[PDB]
Amino acid sequence: LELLSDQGYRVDGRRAGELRKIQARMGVFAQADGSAYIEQGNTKALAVVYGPHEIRGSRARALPDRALVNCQYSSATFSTGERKRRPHGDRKSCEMGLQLRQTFEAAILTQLHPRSQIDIYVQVLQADGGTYAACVNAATLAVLDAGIPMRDFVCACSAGFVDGTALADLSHVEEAAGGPQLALALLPASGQIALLEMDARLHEDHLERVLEAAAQAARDVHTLLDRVVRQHVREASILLG
Amino acid sequence: GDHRRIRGPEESQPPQLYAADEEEAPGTRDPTRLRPVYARAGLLSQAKGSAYLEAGGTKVLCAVSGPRQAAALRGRLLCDFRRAPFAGRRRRAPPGGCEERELALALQEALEPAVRLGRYPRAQLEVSALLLEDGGSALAAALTAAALALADAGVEMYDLVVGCGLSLAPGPAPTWLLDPTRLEEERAAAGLTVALMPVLNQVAGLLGSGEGGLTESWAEAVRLGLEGCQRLYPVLQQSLVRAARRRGAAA
Amino acid sequence: NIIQEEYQEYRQTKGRSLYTLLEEIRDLALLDVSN
Amino acid sequence: MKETPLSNCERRFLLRAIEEKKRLDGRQTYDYRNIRISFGTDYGCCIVELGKTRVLGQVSCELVSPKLNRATEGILFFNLELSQMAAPAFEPGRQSDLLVKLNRLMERCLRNSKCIDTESLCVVAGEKVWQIRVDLHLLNHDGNIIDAASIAAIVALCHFRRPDVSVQGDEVTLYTPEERDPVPLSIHHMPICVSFAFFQQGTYLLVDPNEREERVMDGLLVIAMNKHREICTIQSSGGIMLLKDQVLRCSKIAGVKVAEITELILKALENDQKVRKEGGKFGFAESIANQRITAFKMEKAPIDTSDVEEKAEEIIAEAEPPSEVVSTPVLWTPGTAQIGEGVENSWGDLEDS
Amino acid sequence: MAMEMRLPVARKPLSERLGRDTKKHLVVPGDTITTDTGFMRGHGTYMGEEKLIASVAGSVERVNKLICVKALKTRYIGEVGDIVVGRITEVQQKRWKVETNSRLDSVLLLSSMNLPGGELRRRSAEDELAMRGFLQEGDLISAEVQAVFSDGAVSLHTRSLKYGKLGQGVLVQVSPSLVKRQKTHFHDLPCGASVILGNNGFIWIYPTPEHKGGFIANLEPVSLADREVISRLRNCIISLVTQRMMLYDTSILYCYEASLPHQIKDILKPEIMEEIVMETRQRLLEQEG
Amino acid sequence: TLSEAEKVYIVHGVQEDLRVDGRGCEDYRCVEVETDVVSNTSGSARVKLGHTDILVGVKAEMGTPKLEKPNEGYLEFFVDCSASATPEFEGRGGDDLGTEIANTLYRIFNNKSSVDLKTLCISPREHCWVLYVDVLLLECGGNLFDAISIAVKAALFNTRIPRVRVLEDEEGSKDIELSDDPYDCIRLSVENVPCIVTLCKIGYRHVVDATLQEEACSLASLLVSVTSKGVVTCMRKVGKGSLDPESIFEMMETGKRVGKVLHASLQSVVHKEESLGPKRQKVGFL
Amino acid sequence: MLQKREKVLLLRTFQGRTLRIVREHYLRPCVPCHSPLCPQPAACSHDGKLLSSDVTHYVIPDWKVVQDYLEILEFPELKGIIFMQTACQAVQHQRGRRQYNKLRNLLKDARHDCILFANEFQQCCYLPRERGESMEKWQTRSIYNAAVWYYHHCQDRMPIVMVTEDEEAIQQYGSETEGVFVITFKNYLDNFWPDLKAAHELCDSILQSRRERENESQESHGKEYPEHLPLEVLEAGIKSGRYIQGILNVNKHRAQIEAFVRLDILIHGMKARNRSIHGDVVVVELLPKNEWKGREPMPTGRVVGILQKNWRDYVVTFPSKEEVQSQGKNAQKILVTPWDYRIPKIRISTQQAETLQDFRVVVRIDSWESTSVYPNGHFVRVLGRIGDLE
Amino acid sequence: EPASLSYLSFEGATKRNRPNVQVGDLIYGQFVVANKDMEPEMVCIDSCGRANGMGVIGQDGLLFKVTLGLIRKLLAPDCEIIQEVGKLHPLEIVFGMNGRIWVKAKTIQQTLILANILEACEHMTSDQRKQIFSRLAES
């Protein structure tokens, strides 16, 4: 099956270094302390966070120096072509939520809430392509909605490598083809990487180019989400006064 | 499969699905009769309170443990419903079942309206019921027995709980029946079970689902359920009298 | 070309090293010089 | 129970050392702790010791029916496990956030690299095919669990030898090491993990850190890269914030180190095969150091089995025979009978009525 | 009774219905704020390398050396001499625990409590037994913050006559940034009820205490003419708090007067709220302006 | 939880036909049902009764008939309770509530005439259609039963069930052949799908659509399942207090009337939403 | 910039499971048109192979004229061809990999006038399906609209000639835009290119062989080999004395025809050979003397079932590079060439074909299937290297 | 079980001039109650009350762990281990009967060498072995 024609167009019609269309929203729920909603291409995510509160259970499990970030992950049973229902014991949700806890224990400036918990929940309503970057961006937006301070605006994007070229924002069709996928979590101001992932084989000479293309696609996501945040803050400033 | 049990065959189809004897015909009866019931209290010796209830083809054993450590200002009432695997047409998975949890909750939302937990702060009561055989109305036995066990174990309650059961005939002129059996329950269209306090005259629990959609049949099903709960009371009246006469005379 | 600068850079340590000596000390302390 | 806490003197001591670029046990930055392999007697069993860590690897295969779809391959389980003896803290159900990342590291490396040939592990299609199942155990925790676990899995998989079968027409047959000789496996490449630790916000790095150096570190970078020049996985984790020249430096380091490690592994497997083929003695027994106080050897010994007949005979003869009060069974009504002191009446009746 | 079933309507963004341009300075996390020779960081910002970097979305407010960013969604932060309202969630041996929408729990010490009697009779260990009897689980108090602990905790005291356990009424919870700072947070609105505008986001509405500490129960029926007023204020408070309006006495009085013409049951519609908020906006515009 | 004085004020108000919102003893707050929100599924709904939030999905798949009857399909319910709704629902903890709702829904739908079962069988003893109803709790704001029994009738009204004309003949292509048309489906005749009506009892008066605060002041309640035609399917009593025989008879009339009005108004609103088709766009979560 | 749209699909898997997979589509403003009269160079910049205007016209098959008649459109006298990607996609998803590989070689060549056009990635040539449709009608509609757009972008300067083998496109589409015709192919040739009579004769050849085509393809139905049957039939048919059974061999000069049935019965044909291999024990009836053939009329047979079932285990090879790079790079199915002329080719599924093109391998056989003309297989083990004695 | 100090157990400590003790610091001190009836309790100045080197120790050294046998061997009146080991590298040690040792050499290299070579002195009996080992490590 052709994943890259001779003219250079992909299956869905975009070039190598081209992103999908994103369409976000801020302030979706009322009961919670924060909310967000993002649709990166054809993947629909959702995130809900709860502000610093008293530690549940009170089982002397606190940290006297910082706060306790607790992130979960779930997925609807109609998120793909087949039903594929899973119990709440799978190790895919735990490992992705553990990478989420790892990146948000590094992005959030957590040494300001001693003896406090931060509960982060992510719900995926339709998964087609990169789920990790959509969850990271949806929870960054939900945390911003909650007013929690952070060092920067963390954003994630993936990439690939087919026939000597580097792709960007791979889809499920391209992902399920046995290629060197790779994902980051970037802080735009400093260029630092909070998490790095890859799978399948790839020669060492093209790692620099796949990583650079992924970082550039993350910097391209940064501007598009930045305009959404600026429009939201200008909206609320207009509302206030 | 399970690392805490003895592993056998991975799959096992019971011979009922291969049973070449076609399903028989139940028959007919008078819907104004009750199966004779025998009740005994204080059966187990190592339990704080226990009771054993048997009527026709139904065999249920209930035991009550005393208050233990751990709406406070009030005590909890833990419940646990479990039926023997050797009951009914087929075998059942030992680990559990959604039917067992639904009936456990239908028990919990029916024995708490009787006892007064405002006398056991920070304590809790645990009730365990076991069905040795399913030969008729079951929820009409897991309520009477778990209330008799509570009354013989010396916990303070406002009144007892007496249960009954009903089922709907599948004919062109359906009529509700009292104390149905498996031959009259698997061929039925609907069923109803009531939990009535006989003295306080207050319904404790209600449950019913089926094909009867006119709000004039359920009035009779409810009120004949109330007549059943007022007719089963005297046997439970003499059962606790005999139980207390023997317990006191045992000193 | 690129292979030999970093070859001489990231080799296992050559010969008489401290780790060598301290492991010698460990297995001579646990030795048995009476059989 | 928990682990001894970390003082504020050890942190200071490790960090003045690391700034000065000298470590406790003498090895410089770009060094490994030397390795020591030991082979069992039945195939697919080895003991690797990296420094003072131990891992036990053991492969074993078995014949099942191949699911639905993928009718012409075989399956490959894995199950890492952490033994309570590795360290005080490990507890059967209280360390559930290391097991996951470890099993994952191992599975992504071994199964996505496509070095084992699971194509040619079929007998029929739609019917019985071999299902291998690797198993590793951690015995002693001294830091760098994953390098040792990976080397262990590699050696255990490159030392297994299957059973073997005859298939012709539509008929099966299963041999045994006396009927037919066990057969090796087919291994394309050898993916071997490497780890790096970062100290005081990426300013220094140290190759192959142990458990104390592990408690004074920010985050970890692992880079799994098979032989030749082909990288197979990387997984940054911990608390680190990385640059881009550094990933390349790390890749160079892992290349060099995996070259050397593959040298060692190949040499050890060859020597082991030579020993097994010469005809000498092998196994876990003939590995115990003899120049050491805690080893002792004893050939066989008949102890004296000359007396047991007499003792048993006199014991049986010298004790009281079974007695002869025989009891009677009572019959109430077919179905129930009682034996013992019995009950007075025939049965209770109208006791309280 | 018809059980009206309307359909959702797309929201109109940019607030074009009135039209305003902001003259403020707005920032987002990662933006580099002014980096002159010497400045002091406020709450909402942090420092990197010779840089003042904003860490939360909001608007900068400076008073003469101080760059800080004021976020529009936070949790309550305690300050000395601040009126708060809370609920008891735990009764301990020598304290209670009260939830007041803060990052932690708030402690009400037994040493600071108006015990029944309201005078100098005694204080000893005999009271410790019955302290957990009257202040039971899930009760409402209205106290004043005493001091700030070393980990963001707040200690609150009840050493007055206006503070103590509250009685009948309704509670409405909003965000703790819509209550306007004043010098009198206690009000006696000339409608038939009163209100306490807790700085932590707890709004309590209760009828006027007829003539003239929790000693009185007064568990007797409340007249019909008082419930309709409490329901009117409850709905008006929800209406004013929702879109933007900052809450205080005149806005609530203005909307209450504006709400007489039509019934209390029918005001839940998106447009009736709009036709009341705009009317209150223009009445405030023609009064203040 | 709420104090004793608040409970006394609320019960007195209920006895006076006044409530904190301002409605009466029988008024019902509006809802915002919608359809066709999810793409990958074959039917959707989104019910908003207040602070609560529901989202469901129906997917029709190929399957095998059960043993007792070959000319039928079956229904499988699974009421998930997402942990984003409330922090105490983190991981384990939403299992008991989900099982309670799923078993109640099964009892509601466990009848021969619920919608149909002939339509979902194509070849006796060899094939049948299966329906996957997937409820997803997003927020909890009280009265969850009616807010789910409405989103189920709504999603069931929006099913597709793409028609398959494959011949079962052995000589012919027995393997299931579809119609190859991406927009060729069939309706489901859901006119008489029942719904649940909850009637909380406070004091000696019963209240429809009680809020969480008004639910905490009540001691018992009864659930009735009524179709558009006005027939009863299931009847389960839930609560922590006794009820008395009389109040059953005087709650049945209110359950019947509220059910009839609820069903007629839902038919009217669904026909209004359906009268205009691909126009009006679709807005949800954005 | 771009404009998202969707595409549903109905994929049928091997197990009989269909699914409504949904997928993406991204339109663009400016699809390059690779023409020398594009009235704005910069917007696309024409960075590829670019025609030179000398021709009288331009002919675009709609989908079929390149599906089957492709073998015509190679003559270096033919000039001015442009391919619409929708036809390429049709032929790829309908004609396997061989015809498509010739087509893509045709395109990737600086000898002809072939280019490719992004009909489906252009913002006003894309059209969505409607109530009541088919791939053919939707296809012709899309091709028509693409033609009209290309004409109007050309400013009505170069006369487009839409050729079809559809007749209804002729009667309707070709009458409502001045400067563009919908004519049949032979009419195209005659009307324009007489001295190409060689093509005229090859077209008449292929059109008479076309009239054949439907007759051979509709006289084949849905069965390829006689279906087998039980054994009790074969005991009886032996005993009653209507079935001989012996060994069976094949010639090797001629190995698809000259099959012998050692009692010699001449088996002619694969459809007569009925999925069976040498060294086998097959039961056979006789046949009427009016249908026997020559080497005189010999007693040919008919095999219905195989009692006893004797296989073996051969040595085969993998295809060549320039025909693997076209298989994809994750090419599940593959074809293998045996080493003796007596054996058919075998269908197996592997994922190492691009790094074993210098080795002999070994396979076996599990099941002969009738929806394939070949038998299925699976790899067994590696062998030595082609070139060294070992 | 963990032990238990008191704020006034240090030298000259009162309700006002409390001593500075953080979490995760090493203390030299002696026991006064160690029966199997309570958590052990230790005071940290003296019997009389003048802290003789006791209190919080360790600022630029290394604390490692050895077995009880080596501690018993070193704490002997006829032990020449410390004198000879200190002949090569000047040192100062504070032994602990729980299996802990605090060392402080001059150079970090010497501290590494003393830390490694002291754990092995329980074995490798003197004379035929010790002089050659000392000569080899001289370097």
Side-chain angles (χ1 to χ4, degrees), chain G residues 126 132 156 165 328:
Chain G
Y126 180 73
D156 299 352
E165 201 176 10

Side-chain angles (χ1 to χ4, degrees), chain B residues 242 245-246, chain D residues 351-353:
Chain B
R242 297 174 198 264
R245 208 163 64 158
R246 272 177 304 203
Chain D
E351 217 61 22
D352 58 25
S353 58

Side-chain angles (χ1 to χ4, degrees), chain F residues 39-42 62 127 160 162 170-171 175-176 178-185, chain G residues 8-10 12-20 22 129-134 223:
Chain F
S39 279
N40 189 179
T41 189
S42 303
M62 221 55 88
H127 274 79
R160 307 328 292 198
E170 294 81 351
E171 188 277 336
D175 189 67
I176 299 299
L178 271 56
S179 200
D180 296 337
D181 196 298
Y183 62 92
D184 211 3
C185 301
Chain G
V8 75
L9 305 172
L10 305 180
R12 184 203 89 78
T13 63
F14 285 164
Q15 292 82 240
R17 294 284 76 78
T18 54
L19 283 72
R20 296 179 73 193
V22 188
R129 294 259 293 284
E130 295 169 45
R131 294 288 295 163
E133 198 151 345
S134 73
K223 305 210 168 211

Side-chain angles (χ1 to χ4, degrees), chain F residues 221-265:
Chain F
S221 58
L222 194 79
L223 312 188
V224 191
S225 176
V226 69
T227 57
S228 59
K229 316 281 187 53
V231 304
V232 184
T233 298
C234 182
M235 184 179 289
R236 153 174 180 238
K237 177 259 174 187
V238 64
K240 63 95 185 179
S242 300
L243 60 78
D244 190 276
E246 185 36 35
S247 184
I248 300 299
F249 182 76
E250 282 320 281
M251 62 80 70
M252 290 297 103
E253 299 296 319
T254 310
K256 94 181 188 65
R257 212 73 53 89
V258 176
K260 68 170 277 296
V261 176
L262 191 151
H263 284 286
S265 176

